Design an enzyme around this catalytic site. Structure first.
Site, short mmCIF file in Angstrom:
data_model
loop_
_atom_site.label_atom_id
_atom_site.label_comp_id
_atom_site.label_asym_id
_atom_site.label_seq_id
_atom_site.Cartn_x
_atom_site.Cartn_y
_atom_site.Cartn_z
N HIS A 38 0.80 -1.06 0.16
CA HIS A 38 0.06 -0.07 -0.06
C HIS A 38 0.88 1.41 0.06
O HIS A 38 1.85 1.13 0.23
CB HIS A 38 -0.71 -0.11 1.42
CG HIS A 38 -1.69 -1.25 1.45
ND1 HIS A 38 -3.35 -0.79 1.53
CD2 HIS A 38 -1.55 -2.57 1.31
CE1 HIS A 38 -3.70 -2.09 1.93
NE2 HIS A 38 -2.70 -3.29 1.58
N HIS A 68 -3.94 7.17 3.72
CA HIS A 68 -3.42 5.93 3.15
C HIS A 68 -4.76 5.21 2.10
O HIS A 68 -5.80 5.56 2.43
CB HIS A 68 -3.09 4.95 4.06
CG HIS A 68 -4.02 4.39 4.77
ND1 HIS A 68 -4.80 3.04 5.01
CD2 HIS A 68 -4.64 5.11 6.14
CE1 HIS A 68 -5.45 3.18 5.98
NE2 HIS A 68 -5.56 4.08 6.62
N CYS A 87 -3.13 2.17 -6.76
CA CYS A 87 -1.83 2.68 -5.76
C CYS A 87 -1.14 3.88 -6.47
O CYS A 87 -1.08 4.88 -5.81
CB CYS A 87 -1.19 1.34 -5.28
SG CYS A 87 -2.05 0.42 -4.09
#
EC number: 2.3.1.-
Length: 125
Positions: free
Chosen positions: A23, A35, A113
């Protein structure tokens, strides 16, 4: 090393080994991070109604560094800044606090991502 742990820099981004996958996160404050929660679940869901299927939707979330790092490994890896950009650090932290609560669906996890950390930067990229 002499240090007790790795230190993330404010407005820079961190690669997080959170799970059976990698991540990204952005250090918005002293101990606080933005995040990504990916558009896929962990494989082997464990329910009598569903195991192999893992399809879902992505979400950008706010959390503590010590929670994002708890039980996990990590590294500062600000790719495009290491490649070229000077970067307006306060406007990156402001952009992360605007990206909190954003959702995504059309891209696969690897690009989901990268497209997230490109939207966290987005300034001098």
């Amino acid at each position: 090393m002499a240090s007790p742990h790795q230190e993330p820099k404010p407005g820079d981004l961190i690669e997080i080994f959170r799970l059976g996958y990698e991540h990204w996160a952005l250090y918005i404050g002293d101990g606080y991070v933005i995040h990504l929660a990916p558009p896929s679940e962990y494989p082997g869901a464990g329910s009598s109604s569903v195991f192999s299927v893992l399809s879902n939707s992505a979400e950008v979330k706010r959390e503590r560094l010590e929670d994002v790092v708890g039980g996990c490994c990590y590294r500062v890896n600000n790719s495009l800044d290491h490649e070229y950009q000077p970067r307006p650090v306060e406007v990156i932290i402001s952009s992360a606090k605007e990206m909190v609560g954003q959702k995504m669906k059309y891209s696969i996890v690897s690009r989901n991502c990268e497209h997230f950390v490109t939207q966290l930067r987005y300034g001098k990229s």
